[PDB]
């Protein structure tokens, strides 16, 4: 089992479309009813859903937000009735310090909800977090929740889908929020970086479609856990096989781009997952780990041949000081198999360091002139000084040095 903590407008939407994808996959009706064709289903549902006496299924989700508008719109959607009104929380009434201050203020009810959800699962495995690191809501609230959660639950995993601000496109106060959120991520987060720049780049070459792609990534990541097989039957198995990450998915094709039914082997897919173009995020930098989850018919002989050929062709580079993985799953029996075989890749690669070097460069490009610090001084945390900022910057520098 698992819980999802989505914050800010970004996280709220991310959750909306993630649950849309999930209910599509598992044959869950918009109202929580189960379709007749899926009555005898074999798919495991406990992982993301828990059924109710009324036979309806409820997501293990909690909605958090500093503002009402987004969630109010969500509850006007056809999927509104699905969520649990008890879990959803809205502030009665864009800065990280303010977000953390509110988090300190509204500890009690949030952790009440979290405890209630936790006690309903026998074998909870970890946490899932969806948020944006730039905006005031996501950054600060996620920081506070991560801190108090790592404190509260020292034996549960914490996974996040953190969305990073666009850089080629010029939050004016993004450097501070990003740097602080990164501090908290290093200091508490167990383990999926995301950026609007490269994401929209691949989308080209509304937020609805972008986050549909993101939800696709999340669902494909959690597929095998959802669909038990032989190997990789747990999230901890995933994490151990890799341990910051980046992702790529081959069949990112429009509903109109099915006309080119290209004979898609496993070799061509796994190859495509390697190119920098498909890496959805934007010094002979090299890899640390690679995982490829493959959906559809697959012959392990083909997998071995592809691995052999790629190894000989040396299209990849590895650390000199240490000695990939190809897991196979099964598609949901419901969504059309427009793709003969499909592939998702999650990897750890040193080049990601550059991200922080940019943000650090951004942050250093402001701290020398004290820009937009007036609001921060208002909050208690930065009321006296900003040693928090210095510690966070040095922590990020240490991480970059370690990479």
């Amino acid at each position: 089992e698992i819980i999802t903590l989505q914050l800010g407008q970004c996280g709220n939407q991310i959750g909306f479309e993630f649950w849309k994808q999930l209910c599509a996959e598992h044959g869950i009706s918009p109202e929580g009813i189960v379709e007749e064709f899926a009555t005898e289903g074999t798919d495991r549902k406990d992982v993301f859903f828990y059924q109710a006496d009324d036979e309806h299924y409820i997501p293990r989700a909690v909605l958090l937000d500093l503002e009402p508008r987004v969630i109010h719109s969500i509850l006007n959607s056809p999927y509104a009735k699905l969520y649990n009104p008890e879990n959803i929380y809205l502030s009665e009434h864009n800065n990280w310090a303010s977000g953390f201050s509110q988090g300190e203020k509204i500890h009690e009810d949030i952790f009440d909800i979290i405890d209630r959800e936790a006690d309903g699962s026998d074998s909870l495995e970890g946490f899932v977090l969806c948020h944006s690191i730039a905006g005031g809501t996501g950054s600060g609230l996620g920081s506070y929740l991560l801190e108090r959660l790592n404190d509260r639950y020292p034996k549960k995993l914490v996974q996040t889908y953190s969305v990073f601000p666009n850089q080629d496109e010029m939050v004016v106060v993004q450097p501070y929020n990003s740097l602080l959120t990164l501090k908290r991520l290093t200091q508490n987060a167990d383990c999926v970086v995301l950026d609007n720049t490269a994401l929209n780049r691949i989308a080209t070459d509304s937020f609805s479609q972008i986050n549909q792609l993101v939800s696709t990534i999340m669902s494909a990541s959690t597929t095998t856990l959802r669909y038990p097989g032989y190997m990789n039957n747990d999230l901890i198995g995933l994490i151990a096989s890799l341990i910051f990450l980046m992702t790529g998915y081959t069949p990112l094709t429009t509903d109109q781009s099915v006309a080119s039914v290209r004979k898609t082997t496993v070799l061509d897919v796994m190859r495509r997952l390697l190119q920098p173009k498909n890496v959805m995020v934007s010094t002979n930098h090299c890899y640390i780990a690679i995982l490829n989850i493959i959906q559809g018919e697959v012959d392990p002989t083909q997998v071995h041949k592809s691995l052999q050929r790629i190894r000989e062709r040396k299209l990849a580079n590895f650390i000199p000081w240490g000695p990939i993985q190809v897991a196979l799953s099964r598609k949901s029996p419901y969504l059309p198999s427009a793709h003969r075989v499909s592939g998702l890749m999650m990897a750890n690669h040193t080049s990601i360091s550059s991200l922080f070097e940019r943000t650090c460069r951004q942050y250093d490009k402001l701290r020398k002139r004290e820009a937009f610090l007036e609001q921060f001084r208002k909050e208690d945390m930065f009321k006296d000084n900003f040693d928090e900022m210095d510690t966070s910057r040095e922590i990020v520098q240490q991480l970059i040095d370690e990479y």
Binding site: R69, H93, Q167, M170, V173, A203, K368, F372
Partner: protein, 431 residues
């Protein structure tokens, strides 16, 4: 839940409020009597029946404009007690509106604002509409802002002010009132979205083909700007932006808080028919120096923060591509201490066309709030005019014989000199 109170002071503020509330009633489907044949909650309150009372006060020291409101088509929309009026105006005198005539009305205005705040659940802040070169638009605005800071010392206070134009002017004592207001409110304000009548006249002539616009068209354009600003509170969008977001992303230092407003799809019906206004086109129009609604050339200074508020059929990828194109431009230069100078907001509601207006119906629009050092030249012009008039000591007797001292004149001028120095300092590159 995210209720906000709009305060309209003076003739300029009251007429802009007329345009703004006409636009709000049209957008939310509210009839001019408050009845409808949620989204309409940050600006309207429901009283039992379908009656929707706007969450605003109309305060003036002159009965004329408020009485026009009281007897117009919206006579039954506003609460009669929230249309506060005096007996004798401030006569373009800051001292009258701040010390002598404004002190007999400020208590009533504060009581009404307290009633409105109590009626709210979560107060986001205040929207103050006023003019810089008016009596009650300057003195009473400064007095009210200071009293609000005393009372609501934490809520954001955004003000929509009509900055005096570089050349055209309707009053002779505008520099005095403008400098004194800048002093007093700069002590007690969050950010001031600025606009010029001359610039909107030029925009109307060039884009809307109108050769004889009135204050009505200017007020309609300003109301469109305000609607674009508050759409995130009033509607649902991909990227929501609140008032605190404006305050945080547009104000780098406490004193440098004077962004300039812009609106890209200012176009007539026929021209809109012949064009294919897209995200890139409207963004480029926003950054065009001729489309600024404050008559300051942006090429004379450096941007420090931009807030692009898109609305309607807008795709985030197109917005990102347009902003990247803007950043790659060489005419548009930013300060070196703001590597990220773009706050982006996207709303799903296209702008609503007012029946009888000149703006054509469009599928998407963008409002750009830009904080730039080009406003320093306008400040320099204003303080130069103040220096001339004060060196001759002209009109000073009118201010002094009304509860003010010449020491206040000197202090306000010194504060404006300090503001110019601050703009110069933030303009220079870091070494």
């Amino acid at each position: 839940m995210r209720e906000c109170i709009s305060i309209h002071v003076g003739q300029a503020g009251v007429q802009i409020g007329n345009a703004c509330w006409e636009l709000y009633c049209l957008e939310h489907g509210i009839q001019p009597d408050g009845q409808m044949p949620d989204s309409f909650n940050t600006f309207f309150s429901e009283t039992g029946a379908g009656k929707h009372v706007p969450r605003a006060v109309f305060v003036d020291l002159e009965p004329t404009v408020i009485d026009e409101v009281r007897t117009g088509t919206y006579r039954q929309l506003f609460h009669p007690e929230q249309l506060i009026t005096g007996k004798e105006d401030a006569a373009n005198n800051y001292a009258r509106g701040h010390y002598t005539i404004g002190k007999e009305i400020i208590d009533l205005v504060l009581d009404r604002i307290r009633k409105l705040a109590d009626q709210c659940t979560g107060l986001q802040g205040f929207l103050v509409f006023h003019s810089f070169g008016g009596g009650t638009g300057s003195g009473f605005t400064s007095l009210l802002m200071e009293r609000l800071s005393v009372d609501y010392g934490k809520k954001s206070k955004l003000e929509f002010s009509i900055y005096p134009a570089p050349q055209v002017s309707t009053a002779v004592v505008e520099p005095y009132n403008s400098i004194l207001t800048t002093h007093t409110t700069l002590e007690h304000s969050d950010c001031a979205f600025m606009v010029d009548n001359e610039a909107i006249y030029d925009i109307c002539r060039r884009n809307l083909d109108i050769e004889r616009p009135t204050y009505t068209n200017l007020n309609r354009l300003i109301s469109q700007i305000v609607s674009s600003i508050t759409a995130s509170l009033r509607f649902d969008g991909a990227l929501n932006v609140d008032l605190t977001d404006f305050q945080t992303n547009l104000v780098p230092y406490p004193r440098i808080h004077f962004p300039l407003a812009t609106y890209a799809p200012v176009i007539s019906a026929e021209k809109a028919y012949h064009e294919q206004l897209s995200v890139a086109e409207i963004t480029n129009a926003c950054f065009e120096p001729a489309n600024q609604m404050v008559k300051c050339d942006p090429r004379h200074g450096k941007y420090m923060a931009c807030c692009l508020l898109y609305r309607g059929d807008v795709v985030p990828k197109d917005v990102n591509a347009a902003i990247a194109t803007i950043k790659t431009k060489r005419s548009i230069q930013f300060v070196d201490w703001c590597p990220t100078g773009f706050k982006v907001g996207i709303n799903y509601q296209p702008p609503t066309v007012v029946p009888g207006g000149d703006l054509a119906k469009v599928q998407r629009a963008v409002c750009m709030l830009s904080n730039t050092t080009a406003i320093a030249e306008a400040w320099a012009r204003l303080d130069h005019k103040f220096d001339l008039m004060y060196a001759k000591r002209a009109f000073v007797h009118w201010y002094v014989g009304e509860g003010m001292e010449e020491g206040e004149f000197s202090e306000a001028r010194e504060d404006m000199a300090a503001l110019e120095k601050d703009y110069e300092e933030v303009g220079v590159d870091s070494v």
